[PDB]
Amino acid sequence: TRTLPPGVSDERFDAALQRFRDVVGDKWVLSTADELEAFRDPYPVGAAEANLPSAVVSPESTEQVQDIVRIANEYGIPLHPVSTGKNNGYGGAAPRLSGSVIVKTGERMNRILEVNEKYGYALLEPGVTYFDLYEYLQSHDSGLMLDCPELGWGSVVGNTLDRGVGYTPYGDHFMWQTGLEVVLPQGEVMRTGMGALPGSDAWQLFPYGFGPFPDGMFTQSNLGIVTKMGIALMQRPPASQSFLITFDKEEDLEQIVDIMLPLRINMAPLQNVPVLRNIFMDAAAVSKRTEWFDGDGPMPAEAIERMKKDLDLGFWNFYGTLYGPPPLIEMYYGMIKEAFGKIPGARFFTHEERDDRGGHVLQDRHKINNGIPSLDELQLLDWVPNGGHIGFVPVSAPDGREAMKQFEMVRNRANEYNKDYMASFIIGLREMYHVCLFIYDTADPEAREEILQMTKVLVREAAEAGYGEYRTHNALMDDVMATFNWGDGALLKFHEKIKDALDPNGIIAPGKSGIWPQRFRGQNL
Amino acid sequence: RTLPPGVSDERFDAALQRFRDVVGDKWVLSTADELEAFRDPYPVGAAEANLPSAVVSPESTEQVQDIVRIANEYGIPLHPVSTGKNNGYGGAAPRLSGSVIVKTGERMNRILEVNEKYGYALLEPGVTYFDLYEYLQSHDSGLMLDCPELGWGSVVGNTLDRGVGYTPYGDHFMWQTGLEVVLPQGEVMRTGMGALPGSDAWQLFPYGFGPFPDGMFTQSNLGIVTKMGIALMQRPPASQSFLITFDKEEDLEQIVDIMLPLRINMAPLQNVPVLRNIFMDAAAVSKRTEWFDGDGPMPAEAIERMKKDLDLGFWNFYGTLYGPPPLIEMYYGMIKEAFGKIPGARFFTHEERDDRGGHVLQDRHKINNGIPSLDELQLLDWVPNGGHIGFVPVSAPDGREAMKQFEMVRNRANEYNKDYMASFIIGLREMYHVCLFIYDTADPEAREEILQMTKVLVREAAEAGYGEYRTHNALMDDVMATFNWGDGALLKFHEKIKDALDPNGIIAPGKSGIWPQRFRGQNL
């Protein structure tokens, strides 16, 4: 029947719902099954129901977020704060803890508070999407560009608060995060950095302020509800060129990664975040699985060759963008061609050179890499009927043999659980991300369970090989946090200890990143 | 005899022996003669302050655990340092008098790893910039380090006070990647991929999984750091350092305003731009008495003599470029066209000045190329028994803000009879007004003048909306008090976390104005 917060009666919840309505207004509290359906994980993981929200409250202001937090303390209601709630791949808007109330900050707190052309920064509310901020910069003939992930409909703030990434030189969103406002778990409000000094202009200029630097503690965290966040914005460069390098062989991965890293570690000639996508990923962006293979089980070699041939793509496809005066772009492109040119079968294409279906991903990278938000990459989910995805992203050293081992290890398990291997190898400066998107039929309970059991295996095996996940789904946060158990889980004990100090009543997103406040510890949900 | 607060002669003597049982008899100092060397070398205020009770030098992480556990038992406050060279901010001296200094760097001074492939170091606290430079030279490294002005500090300890250098990797804390820390009750923790047993990425990926804590251990008293990683930048094929002299006090406005556009895209100004006033560059190469032996502020005549003799401006801009010679030349050309629009602007590369005035340029050419130096110690010869205090408000990188800040500080410096040694430094979007006040450390009134002058500068800067990035023991309470948005919400947040991790209030009480429960309200 009715989803309730843990240890909270029908009466007590009805009372708390009304207190919420007194703060934000009747139409900004959802609690009917019909109203809540939209806030369930759109890509559900596992056959069983999980991650069930009891209600959605949409606050209009920081003060309203304080009031909601104080009520949640009164009634012991757990709050799952989101911005836009588009964390698709990691649970969407759905709370880790079933019965939690979703605080959708972004519905009404969606205002651009400042875009400074002189100093190159924005001060944003959670509700500001990449499309909102893009449209604002266009409107105002801005000299600035934003840094967006593959999908423009997410929150600049929300994405930053899960340490999301884009593909411009400003792709590490949390680095460029500068100052935030946060409602702490008992309702008091705090500004970090120069925000903490009344009348400073430097909130979005100097990240650290004075004393311990806390902003990090509010990312992949449950230590408060963020109401404002500053972010630095790069100046748009005078020109840019996007290029695709197709690599013919599965085994080329080793040489590609080993040539990638020297070209990237000095942020030149690879100026942007280098992404290497397998043919599955690029095929899924432009085609249905059944275009290639309507059989059961893993995709055969003949089918993969047909994908490569028809799309004129390799097994591994490298995407990069260069920025600056055309001479500098041409110099950097020349270096890139010489270095990756030593791999037999490497073929090169600029964004101007491919208008065919195989080229559509390059055209999308040319947008995303230039801070032009897109939703083209939603086409991935038409690979199979009713397509959803889960993100599996272990962090690796950027070595060719280390990539090769991860390639084998994950494709092998993928095959066993009848899921295709959609994978990208991405490099920051000195780290490698194995970005695996498993696409499955969300309507099929067996496919959902296969995904939950497969990724549980993939997490454990990756950790046995010394690979930690940078980010994970609601279903895997306990399993993943368990892997960071150096010194008898010293890290988790440190986090719990702080969680209990700031959230004595255990209100804020209990179980986020495997961090449960005292009142829930040992209870298996 | 200096004792910890609320600890008897007999309890302390017991505790000193327990320390000896852990680290050895030789590695516990507690005589007045032994402790002299660990007093603030640039003392602030007339009165005695910042008195250590003992110095304990541990050999290992395990020993640090044992010391912290003993400290918890006896309620002894511990001030963890690396090398203890935080000169201008108290040196090795503890904020709280009676604290035991834990000099981690004395014996924990080992380079644990330098990775040529991935460009990083994993370091203990005692590794100095000289130590790590020597290592890189020895091993024919492709890598360069990022050092502050003085090479004798700790790579780790400087990072833990969010210190800065002048290469593209000038933000030390940014490039910090992984640490190991002994938390205030003696348990040991590794951050990031350090927390995943057998990961290779401790020094490759900073964040790891869940909340990002590393920042909480910088300008902090939440533990004793025993290892720290840091990224090292590949040495580029060539570099060129350059000096722009600017003739006029009033040029500051246009310098800062041309400086920001050339810096924010990290090109053409590829390194940290530093603008030094003639006082700064003169004190680097000469004594005060060479220019003016009279009492009180230095007259216009004397300033003009400094400029002529050293062939420098009132404001001197020092930068470095890196890469292929064609790139360096292109960038230098853009810099010359931009700053050239200021009348009286003159340009010199490091190759074009072998005179005394050029000595600072030569020292920057070293520092900006990750070659540690001690040349800038000559600043302390400006007056007899020279010491300095660091006063560094953070500002918008705006000409008129720089100009306001220049007047505001020089006026108060004048009033308290201290010379105005100042640099304007710029990261990407922020500006540091770095003011070194050089004074006679043997003169109790010069000491009191410094304390009272900087107290005034701190609240006057705060009234103008400027916060300090970093400050001295004597000012930490005053400085933290200025960050009082939402009724001092930030300090309240820091205090709850301090009390959660340090229930006995052991680790560096009062660091950054953060006192644990047992000390709050006691005025030391």
Ligand SMILES: *Cc1cc2c(cc1C)nc1c(=O)[nH]c(=O)nc-1n2C[C@H](O)[C@H](O)[C@H](O)COP(=O)(O)OP(=O)(O)OC[C@H]1O[C@@H](n2cnc3c(N)ncnc32)[C@H](O)[C@@H]1O
């Ligand atoms: C399916 C998919 C997903 C995807 C992607 C490609 C595909 C095909 N590419 C991505 C990429 O390139 N980079 C990236 O970082 N993510 C990518 N994803 C995943 C996802 O689409 C995006 O990351 C998305 O932008 C994230 O969702 P959103 O931006 O809406 O953020 P949120 O869901 O509202 O909040 C995220 C989490 O952070 C915490 N949170 C959020 N807001 C707050 C506030 N105000 N206070 C406290 N905590 C907050 C919550 O834990 C929330 O779940």
Ligand SMILES: *Cc1cc2c(cc1C)nc1c(=O)[nH]c(=O)nc-1n2C[C@H](O)[C@H](O)[C@H](O)COP(=O)(O)OP(=O)(O)OC[C@H]1O[C@@H](n2cnc3c(N)ncnc32)[C@H](O)[C@@H]1O
């Ligand atoms: C006088 C002076 C000072 C100076 C400078 C120029 C002059 C003329 N130029 C500097 C510069 O360009 N950049 C910079 O960051 N600092 C500069 N200074 C100040 C100072 O000399 C240096 O910053 C110096 O590197 C700091 O000294 P050191 O490196 O020895 O650091 P420390 O005293 O040992 O530690 C600093 C503080 O951090 C905490 N700490 C240190 N180690 C630990 C450990 N292991 N665990 C926990 N906390 C630790 C303490 O609070 C300590 O006081």
Ligand SMILES: C=CCc1ccc(O)c(OC)c1
């Ligand atoms: C090809 C990149 C897609 C992608 C990148 C980073 C992510 O975190 C992600 O989450 C599911 C998806």
Ligand SMILES: C=CCc1ccc(O)c(OC)c1
């Ligand atoms: C002339 C630059 C010296 C300098 C720079 C940054 C600092 O923090 C500092 O501390 C006292 C001194």
Ligand SMILES: [Ca+2]
């Ligand atoms: Ca072939």
Ligand SMILES: [Ca+2]
């Ligand atoms: Ca032992």
